[PDB]
Design a protein around this nucleic acid. Sequence first.
RNA 1: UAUUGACGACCCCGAUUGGUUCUACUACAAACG
Length: 181
Amino acid sequence: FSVAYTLAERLIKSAKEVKQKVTVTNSSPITPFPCSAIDFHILYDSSGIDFDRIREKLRPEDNTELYNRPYVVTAAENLSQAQGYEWSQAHSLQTLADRVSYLRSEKSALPSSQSHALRTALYLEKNEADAQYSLISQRYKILKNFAEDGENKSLFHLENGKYVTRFLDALDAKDFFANAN
RNA sequence: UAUUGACGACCCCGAUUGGUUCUACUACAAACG
């Protein structure tokens, strides 16, 4: 528990970065706009137990990061009047929950066989991750939803100059999105 | 108006499928009287 809780005390700071990316419009000093967000890990013990090391193993190339994991959970409608609205949508937890649903949807609509081919490619450069995706994008039409480019040819989207993706977060959370409701 | 006057081989592989699906860490030892 101790290691898990000190992770949570770091995860809470990563979720709490919404405090300054989503901010009250025309405020001075720049007050946070009330925004709710999650960050989560899933240790496996493999990722490094220290948050700083955990995230640098998911930034495999200098412009490419395989986590979108500070996810805003506040509704878009509530956020629409803040500054930083556009960021909150890309970081909206519903984008993760939808993609998890596509992975869970069904035989599998996206085969795990092919999800893991893409998972492997994500650790390459974008030109190679996009190459693998282009070998697959029209064999599995569900992948039109997992794209983020706006073109349906890459799993990444550009965010402040970084290629960031939810796809590998969706594979992580695929089995941690269960509810009695 | 319909005549001139006999030679000569060709094909040599073509089309397509080129991976598909599943397993992606599991128990542990540190947590918990």
